[PDB]
């Protein structure tokens, strides 16, 4: 079910995964047309929609430095750690929201980015270079 | 068409007295007054 933009904010993470393109398509293009030339009021909203694309490109750089690159669902090779949210499957995807999920991960979220940027492409690329000659 | 989409099962904590939209609208109204009165007729010689 669609339910439009952010419709599954309180639904399960599994049901919320069914609407990734919906949340993705409405964040980048909130296009205001600034054809009228008004002096001091344009710089504020221009800075706003420029910092918007700066944050978007920061997220895209983070999603490119990883083995994942497709702006979609993707799998990695970094194992999940039992210290992070000691929960089984179906307990997460059927009785939890992405908000509470990021809240519980926020304690251990900072090292996961490092494990994804270094334990992967800093070694996966090097293995790709030393295993593509044969 | 105003895209008004109700989010079911969503309860969100609002606080109107710490909101920042009010500050934005206040500064915008102030700059509106200032930029509306800038190119008009000044009356400094009227102080007689």
């Amino acid at each position, epitope marked *: 079910v669609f339910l439009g933009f952010l419709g599954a904010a309180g*639904s*399960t993470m599994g*049901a919320a995964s069914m609407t990734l393109t919906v949340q993705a398509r409405n964040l980048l293009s909130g296009n205001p047309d600034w054809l009228p030339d008004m002096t001091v009021w344009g710089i504020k909203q221009l800075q706003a929609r420029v910092l918007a694309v700066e944050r978007y490109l920061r997220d895209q750089q983070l999603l490119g430095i990883w083995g994942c690159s497709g702006k979609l669902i993707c799998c990695t090779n970094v194992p999940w750690n039992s210290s992070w949210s000691n929960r089984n499957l179906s307990e997460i995807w059927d*009785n939890m929201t992405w908000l*509470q999920w990021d809240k519980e991960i926020s304690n251990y979220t900072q090292i996961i980015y490092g494990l994804l940027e270094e334990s992967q492409n800093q070694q996966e690329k090097n293995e790709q270079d030393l295993l593509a000659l044969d | 068409n105003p895209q008004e989409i109700h989010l079911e099962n969503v*309860t969100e*904590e609002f606080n109107m007295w710490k909101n920042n939209m009010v500050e934005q609208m206040h500064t915008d109204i102030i700059s509106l007054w200032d930029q509306s009165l800038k190119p008009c007729v000044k009356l400094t010689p009227l102080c007689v």
Partner: nanobody
Amino acid sequence: EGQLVQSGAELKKPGASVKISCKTSGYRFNFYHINWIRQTAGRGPEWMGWISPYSGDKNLAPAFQDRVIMTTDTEVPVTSFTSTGAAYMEIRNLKFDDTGTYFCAKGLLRDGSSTWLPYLWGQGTLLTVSS
């Protein structure tokens, strides 16, 4: 952190009726089904029925289709994740076989094959049908 509280102990006569409350706290009342199951020494435990505070969908046992009526109020949100609802149950045509401890409990999951399964149980409420 859902800490549910049921009603108090009451005494009734056969053929009369009695109403048992089921006040909740610490969790979203509309996010889970509310089960109701009894425990009588004459036939052991028997699942009485569940109800959905969100969609308003109830489901009883065919033996309790006529005498059990389960109602729910609307949840009172305390925080963005906490609400204090209430689930009442009225039982009529009291007989000698309906003497025991009754329970209401919280549903398991919000989606899947076992969504309504009782996880968090109340402390219980004992009823004695006697003249």
